[PDB]
């Protein structure tokens, strides 16, 4: 299940609730084609991988969060663990996403 | 100066107002660092070149325009002339931007 972050406070809570699990964050916009293309794949992955936390941030709803993470090319996937940045992926390359998940959990 | 497109009707109005001139449209977001860094360069180009018209579209304010032009990266530059799309440029690559301007104007 890919949880939709409501705001900065909610974002912090989710990163805390993750504990020591890898967190994958999808920064997306509803007007972005590639974002909508990869969203179902992220949902499917999140249903199987109970040991990775999957989040999504709508940049139009959470502009403050988008600005904090230097987002530019969408979708952007940020990889975090224990509240700390590990990696980042620009674009909807599912194979690269899997390689980064494999590396980082 | 770079005119901010207000909506879809305003976009058509600006494209008409440009006459035969090349139009460069900057799709941007206020949360995007690279957009902010190149914005002043576009202002200078706008003030300097009288045979090119420069426009900007805030994707947060005109999500419909963003979707219809299939923006995915910020900033994205669309190059139009007499209503026709000639080229597109993803990212804040000023040299490539200048290149597409000299070529299409």
Automatic annotation (TrEMBL), chains A, B:
SUPFAM superfamilies: Thioredoxin-like (SSF52833). Disulfide bonds join 32-35, 32-35. Pfam families: Thioredoxin. Keywords: Disulfide bond, Electron transport, Metal-binding, Redox-active center, Transport, Zinc. It comes from the Eukaryota. One of its GO terms (molecular function) is metal ion binding. Residues 1-105 form the Thioredoxin domain. The active site is at residues 32, 35. CDD domains: TRX_family. The record marks 33-34 as: Contributes to redox potential value. The keyword Metal-binding applies. The keyword Electron transport applies. The record marks 26 as: Deprotonates C-terminal active site Cys. Zn(2+) binds at residues 60, 63. Belongs to the thioredoxin family. NCBIfam families: thioredoxin. This is Thioredoxin. It comes from Penaeus vannamei (Whiteleg shrimp).
């Amino acid at each position: 299940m890919v949880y939709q972050v409501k705001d900065q406070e909610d974002f912090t809570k989710q990163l805390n609730e993750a504990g020591n699990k890898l967190v994958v964050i999808d920064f997306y916009a509803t007007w972005c084609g590639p974002c909508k293309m990869i969203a179902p794949k992220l949902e499917e992955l999140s249903q199987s991988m109970s040991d990775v936390v999957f989040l999504k941030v709508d940049v139009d709803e959470c502009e403050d969060i988008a600005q904090d993470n230097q987002i530019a090319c969408m979708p952007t996937f940020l990889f975090m663990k224990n509240g700390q940045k590990l990696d980042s992926l620009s674009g909807a390359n599912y194979d690269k996403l899997l390689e980064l998940v494999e590396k980082n959990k």
